[PDB]
Design a protein around this ligand. Structure first.
Ligand SMILES: CC1=CC(C)=[N+]2C1=Cc1ccc(CCC(=O)NCCOc3ccccc3CC3CC4(C3)CN(C(=O)N3CC5(COC(=O)N5)C3)C4)n1[B-]2(F)F
Length: 290
């Protein structure tokens, strides 16, 4: 009986990678027909999975980048208790393993990171561990500062869980209605069986708060070029965090675009926003691969 995804598919039938904890991570690749000009790792966020990046990945592949991703532990088709992580650094360690593996297979190529929300915090922390080694980072509403209502809710609950033994204490789910003004994208999110929409475990929310704390400490070490895209009406990642990232990162090549009125998932927003997001990422990555 082979090791299977949480959805019962044998890993031997799928692209995969075994992490340092012996857990199978489901992997995705979008490689061009020609010779790749760069590599780019796509880092998905909490609750979701790498298949939600199909359209972005196909655009980047069309620029002759080799796009690759995996489902973070506890997410999508990867192993692990759902939306649990022993420590947030597991996510960063696993990204670095996959990046290092791909860099061996495609030596000499520059490597970019792209991350949304929790995946953007992962990307920041990944780049901060390897100053000078990444060519650029694209951040879509990265988790730099949590929505303050969410932060206060979990900080109070964290007091219970950090002082008692309450392993399964949960709060509300990530609210789908604040993900996007595009109702069809909200409905798609609520329909995808690979998305975990349960109430957030307090221990997982604690790791999200750990991510915020570690991102703050990482900013003085962050020198990678980056493009930062942020909606002004984001009720999940506070736009104040995007401004603070622009202020505190030491990168010499940093650009912020604010989408006025837009919600959290900018690459799945109203068409005017999403089209701009795709266009801006295309141009920014193109300029830095040439
Ligand atoms: C007056 C009032 C009363 C109450 C009660 N509220 C009030 C007001 C507000 C305002 C907002 C909220 C709630 C907003 C909400 O849902 N928080 C969820 C909990 O978040 C956290 C919990 C702990 C730590 C940190 C956070 C914030 C992070 C940011 C992410 C949660 C989103 N994720 C992420 O990586 N990605 C990928 C996704 C999925 O797929 C996509 O495509 N992208 C989303 C990480 N309230 B309220 F509290 F309801």
């Amino acid at each position: 009986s082979p090791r299977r995804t949480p959805q019962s598919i044998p890993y031997q039938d799928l692209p995969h990678l075994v992490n340092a904890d012996g857990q199978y991570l489901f992997c995705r690749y979008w490689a061009p027909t020609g010779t790749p000009k760069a590599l780019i790792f796509v880092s998905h966020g909490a609750g979701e999975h790498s298949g939600r990046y199909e359209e972005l990945a196909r655009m980047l592949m069309g620029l002759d980048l080799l796009v690759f991703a995996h489902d973070h532990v506890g997410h999508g088709q990867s192993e692990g208790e759902r939306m649990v992580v022993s420590d947030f650094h597991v996510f960063v360690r696993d990204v670095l393993q996959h990046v290092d593996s791909m860099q061996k297979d495609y030596p000499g190529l520059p490597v970019f990171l792209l991350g949304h929300s929790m995946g953007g915090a992962i990307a920041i922390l990944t780049a901060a561990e390897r100053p000078g080694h990444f060519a650029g980072m694209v951040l879509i509403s990265p988790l730099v500062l949590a929505n303050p209502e969410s932060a206060t809710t979990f900080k109070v609950l964290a007091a219970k869980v950090l002082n008692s033994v309450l392993p399964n204490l949960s709060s509300g789910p990530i609210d789908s209605s604040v993900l996007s003004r595009n109702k069809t994208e909200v409905d798609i999110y609520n329909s995808d069986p690979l998305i975990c929409r349960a109430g957030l475990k307090v221990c997982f929310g604690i790791q999200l708060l750990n991510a915020v704390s570690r991102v703050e400490r990482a900013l003085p070490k962050l020198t990678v070029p980056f493009l930062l895209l942020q909606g002004s009406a984001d009720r999940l990642c506070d736009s104040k965090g995007a401004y603070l990232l622009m202020e505190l990162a030491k990168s010499q090549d940093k650009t912020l675009k604010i989408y006025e009125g837009a919600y959290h998932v900018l690459h799945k927003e109203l068409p005017e926003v999403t089209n701009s997001v795709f266009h801006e990422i295309n141009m920014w990555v193109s300029q830095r691969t040439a």
